[PDB]
Amino acid sequence: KQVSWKLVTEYAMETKCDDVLLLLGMYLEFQYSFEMCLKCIKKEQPSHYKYHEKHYANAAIFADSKNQKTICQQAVDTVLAKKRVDSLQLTREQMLTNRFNDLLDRMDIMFGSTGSADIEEWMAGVAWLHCLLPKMDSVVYDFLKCMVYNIPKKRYWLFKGPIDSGKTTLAAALLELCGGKALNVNLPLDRLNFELGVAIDQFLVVFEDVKGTGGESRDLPSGQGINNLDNLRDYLDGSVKVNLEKKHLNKRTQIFPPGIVTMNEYSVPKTLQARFVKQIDFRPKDYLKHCLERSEFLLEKRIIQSGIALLLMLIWYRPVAEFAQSIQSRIVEWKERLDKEFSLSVYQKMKFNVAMGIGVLD
Amino acid sequence: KQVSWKLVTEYAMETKCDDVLLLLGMYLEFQYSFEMCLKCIKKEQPSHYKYHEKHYANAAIFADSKNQKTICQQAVDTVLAKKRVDSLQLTREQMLTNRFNDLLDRMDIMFGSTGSADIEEWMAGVAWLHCLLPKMDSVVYDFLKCMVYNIPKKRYWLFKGPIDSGKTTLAAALLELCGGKALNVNLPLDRLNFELGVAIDQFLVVFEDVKGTGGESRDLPSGQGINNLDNLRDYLDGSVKVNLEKKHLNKRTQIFPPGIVTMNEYSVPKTLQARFVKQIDFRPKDYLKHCLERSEFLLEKRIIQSGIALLLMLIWYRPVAEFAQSIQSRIVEWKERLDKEFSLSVYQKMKFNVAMGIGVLD
């Protein structure tokens, strides 16, 4: 009897898998009886245990096929095709709404009964991030709106301050929240071509550590990044399309995505200042350092790195109307859960502890 | 029963799709019942909702096919083949009229009932453009004729001005009007061959912001572009065919298309000055800036960059006789629609606002 290529393609769509080998390997695991399957019983991986019982019959026949990689290629093509349709048709608001739904699904697992995470430790994360800058939650909301509208010239934000000011932490969490890539412009001009190629079809980009020149007056090591950026005015202003390249691929043409620039305290040309909507200053604060010393489960579990943490911050702080209408129903349910799990007193006690530089938990 | 490859080829032809993935992903959407298709019901994408009901039955059988990518490959070849045939057989005038017919079709949507655009905002853009240079509409007509005639050694226009003088803004609109590609020649000579490969079958090209050398006298940064360009005289001259290269592809041979060069105020070898038929200065002007500050919906919606804006300018200013015969019927209808919606006093009020540096509207 025949293999159903359709059931494979459906699994690939549902897992959103787009590596042929990863797709292949996982489907083969279903060939053993789901009824006895230790991976099912131990509830180890949702992309397995949700699916094993459904695909078992087809996996058994798949295991005898002689066409195995051919089946997988067509399946993976279907997933890649769906992505490109979406890229050309969705609004940036819908893109972000989809991205949020993905994170919310991961949170449902993380804090589920199977969930290994501790919602209390993750709320301790939110308390620390809310102390990193004044009006942190309002600042995030502004950044997101700026990315969604993608208004030309009004596109780019500058993070400034010394080593261990925290700027890379916040960049990483934002980059996880929205999706995107880091880029390093400190290179010589020739390699920048493939470097910028990374930006193709991304939502955000982040420029790391754009080294100035002459900051060595204050021990900052000098480099070319600032000059290179000043030579990229149209990529930043985003008013017109640019060509982009990848290794072994022909060029594509698109609006270069919005993003973030990060630096230590180099001097900035006025030509470059004009490019930026907003500059945010990061300054070392000892009470955060002493708090982290006593609350290091934050670092160990990478809580303060994660977009998941920022999403919890938005859920706790923002009015429901601020979210895209479709997901507002899920947001209410999470707000309800958090209101059940914590009183404001509990949360504010944590904020006080952080201000003391004491460990977050008491 | 079996897949009709013919119906897929029709869909590719009618959508003018030439990406195999986009074609695939699009066609797969039709497999669900159009009668419930929310994309149809919400009238979100014409390249969907026009076609779903027609293609539905074949899409269901296509969803079961084991050959899916081969079927799409043949369809995409047919669309590519038609472009090839046209490149060798249309007059340059006919090409331009086809291109115009497509923009006019897009304008029909944008200002339709489903049309989101405000014709008053788009007409405001024409006022700002007609201020950017003396006799602006005459300049556009002269450029269009030059591009149609494609007279050898009389093929290229040079734009000069300081930064923020509007040259790349104007180049963008012409390029969207005619269709074509931008190119960057401030490069090492080795990559340059794959760079020039982009010009294949294009109508225009634009060489963007070519760097001279010694312009640091004027504080200009310096680079290869001008010296690199003087090695390419025959590409400008267009008197003879040249050979063009793409990655993993053997060379094509054709005449290199006509176009535009933009730069800040470097000096130039007259071996290259001889190649330019015309040179246009651009100058910063305060009232444009002050007007634009109070008119930022122009920038937010990219109106000022977009070829639709130049087409609207021509329809307003130029006689019907100057358009090629077949489109004169549509041109007449659009002229009637514009005149119905705008008095000369309204248009002159807008122009007077721009001159005064108030926001365009009042």
Added chain:
Amino acid sequence: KQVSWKLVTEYAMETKCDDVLLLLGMYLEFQYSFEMCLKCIKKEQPSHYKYHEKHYANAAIFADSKNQKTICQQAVDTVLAKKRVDSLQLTREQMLTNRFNDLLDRMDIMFGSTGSADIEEWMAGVAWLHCLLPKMDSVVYDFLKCMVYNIPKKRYWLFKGPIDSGKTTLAAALLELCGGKALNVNLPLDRLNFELGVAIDQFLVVFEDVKGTGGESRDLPSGQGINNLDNLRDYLDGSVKVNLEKKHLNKRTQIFPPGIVTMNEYSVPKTLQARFVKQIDFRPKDYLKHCLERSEFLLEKRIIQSGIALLLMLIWYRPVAEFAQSIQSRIVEWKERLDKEFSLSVYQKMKFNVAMGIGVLD
């Protein structure tokens, strides 16, 4: 019922088509009923309307086929095979005799009933070229003999003169006449591998304004041209076969075609001077410039740079016996037609106008 691959192959032979996409595109057009084919009715393209009615029946079945690119590939291979057989077995004189028949067929169309070309404008071009150098028609006959005889190390003609001397204009018309390729050697020395690979099976080649050195004294900025050419002395000399490369293709070994090099007046090593059997000096002459200004239809229709114009010159000036026997019949008919449609006094009126620098016509 099934596709005749034989009928397709025959059309590719008939058209001498050798791009698979161009072949595919044009054969598809025959699917619609020739009974109403607007292209046929408008008599626009010979390669269509001559063939549509014959191929229509087979094109309808081709339109359904699943193999389409494969059928086209075999047809293109048959045309390519015919070219290789010919290149290995014809005398160079027969090759040229065939080329002349193809041009004469095009002239029969151009000045035929459809008659898109005015023979008066075309003859005005002949007067302009015959004025460009002394004894012009004698010089063309010398060049043809040289290319036919292909005497080793007596194989190349050098054109020198300042900008707008007309050297490219003459080279362009000659290249069209014989059929051949232009090539750029002002290039990085590695990429020459695939560049020169284009010369496979060609009859004649041209190198462009080849960037030398020493001319910096006169603002000729220098480059790899003369450097590279003084390497390839064997390619010029043609005493031995050389290996030529294409992408995804193993090398072809053959003797390298004769031809022409063009030069603004850089310096040349005498190892290279030894290899040009002849050099011609070209000079700007204002009265030609004044003539062109008033006679711009020459440039706009590209008349003066077409081998069609050179063929008309030879028909006017040379004895019938100088042509190969099989075409002497066609030559006689065109001599008669020319004598009918022009008196000598008209041609003398034209040539006088050219000398005066006024508009050629009066």
Added chain:
Amino acid sequence: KQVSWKLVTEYAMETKCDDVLLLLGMYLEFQYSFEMCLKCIKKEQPSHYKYHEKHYANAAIFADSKNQKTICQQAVDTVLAKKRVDSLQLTREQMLTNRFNDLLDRMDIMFGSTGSADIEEWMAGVAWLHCLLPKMDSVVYDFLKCMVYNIPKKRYWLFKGPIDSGKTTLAAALLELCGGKALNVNLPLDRLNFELGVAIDQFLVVFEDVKGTGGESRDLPSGQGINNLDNLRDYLDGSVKVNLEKKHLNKRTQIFPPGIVTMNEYSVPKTLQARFVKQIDFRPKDYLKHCLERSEFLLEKRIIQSGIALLLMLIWYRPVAEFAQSIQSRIVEWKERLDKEFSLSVYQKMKFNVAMGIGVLD
């Protein structure tokens, strides 16, 4: 019925055709009735007219096939396989006597009833060649034996002489005689590696006018030649096997063939100079120039380049016993034909005219 791939492969073997396009084109000619075949009637090409009648029936069925290139690919591989088997199993003497049989077969045609060449002209070529250097036949006999005995570090001879001093003229004739390949050194080693791949299964090679250094004192521009030569000492010695490259096909390990190198008077490292038995070149004899200038059919028909002229020279000069045994029958047969058609006085008359530098065929 169906195509006999066997009959196709026989033709490929008997033509020794080893290009798939050439073979394809050739065989398709046979599809017409040979009984009226104009080429047969003309006796135009032996590789056609000998075979048309035999292959006609199979060619008709071949003309309808859908596998045509695949059939030709298998046939071509049979021919290459035969070459590869000979390339290892035969002695260098056995190879050479095969080569001579092929040339003798051409001469039988060239002076045959078609007789398109006249042995008197070719004899005048012999006279010019034997006049070019003393005892030319004897120095050739030395070179032949050296190449058969193939002694390492003694596998190569050089010419270092001036331009237009004939070294290429002689190399061409020897290379035609031996059936080697020319190769080009003057390249980046990072691609020369592939070019050397052509040396697979060759009797002999020649390296061309290789760019040294220090020749700059006499305007010879320096380059990669000297560098790449003194690098490849293994190949120059003939020390060991090398894995020679091919595209889309495996590389092959085999020992490199012996050869010749030409240059003008560049530097040569003594580390290189060690590797050559003879390092000898020859310099202009102006009277010969005046002879050529009055005997130009010699050059026009390329007689003095062609290995056929050398073979005629050895037939005249050498003892029958100096040839390999089996061909000595044919050697005697041709010695008869020379002595039948020429007196010594005629040959001497040619040779004094040559030495006098005058036109020869008085």
Added chain:
Amino acid sequence: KQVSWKLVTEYAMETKCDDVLLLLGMYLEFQYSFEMCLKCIKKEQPSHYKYHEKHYANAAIFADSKNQKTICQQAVDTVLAKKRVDSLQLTREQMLTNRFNDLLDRMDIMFGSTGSADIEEWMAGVAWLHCLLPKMDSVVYDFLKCMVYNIPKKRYWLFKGPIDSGKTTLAAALLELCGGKALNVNLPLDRLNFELGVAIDQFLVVFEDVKGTGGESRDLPSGQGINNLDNLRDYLDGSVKVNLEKKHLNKRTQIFPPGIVTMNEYSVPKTLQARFVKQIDFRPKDYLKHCLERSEFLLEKRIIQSGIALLLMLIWYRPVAEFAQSIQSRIVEWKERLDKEFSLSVYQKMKFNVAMGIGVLD
């Protein structure tokens, strides 16, 4: 009836053929009746005549196959797979055992019934070899077993002594017995990086004459080699795996093979000295130079640098027990031959002639 793919695969295994073209060509030869087969009658090649009669029936059907190259590709894979299994599985001792068997077969070739390598010229080579320096057969046996054991640190010998001293000559012969390569180090570090990759997968290696920096105090001209090697601590010791690299290719990781260093009388750091098991110095000798001058047949049939000339030297001197335990059979059989063929007096006469520096084959 049908081609047995099995029989084709047997022949490939038995011949150890691993080029698809050779396999194809040779197997096709069997298609003629073996009963008359003149290659069999002449006993030209065992790879033919040993097999033809067995394979004949299958070869006939093979010649009619339409699939031929596909059969051969699978057969060649079988032989390559066999090598890769053994290459991974077996010991250095087993591998040398087989390398002996190969070279003992080349003795069975060279001194088989054709004797085209004269066993006694090869004895004169053995004489010149053993006369070269002290105790040479033992010095070989020692160095050989040293390289078989590959014991850490105990892995490198230093061949000092001047130009033409023979050190290069001998290493080449041992490399014939085992494979391997020589290596440069005389360069700045960026060169060394890629150069070190040459050692990858070598069963043995050597270093080219180290022009040691700091040898110029001895007036020995130099490059960086001494400081290079003195820094390369591990590579010599072979204590642990190291990484190796090539142009355009990824890194590989392996224990760096053992070997030899060659130099003239250069300066050495005592650290670098500690890396070597033996210090040796070679010198040119007046008897030996005048002997080869008088005995050049040893150069002509490639003897003195041949590994077989070492193999014969070992079969002469070394007892059967010193050879691989089963190959010892062949050792006895060649001992029988050589001891029968040559008296010790002719061997001693030959050695004495070398001791007189006079021609060996008196």
Added chain:
DNA sequence: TTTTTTTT
């Protein structure tokens, strides 16, 4: 697999 990338 070639190519492009890499290497320069």
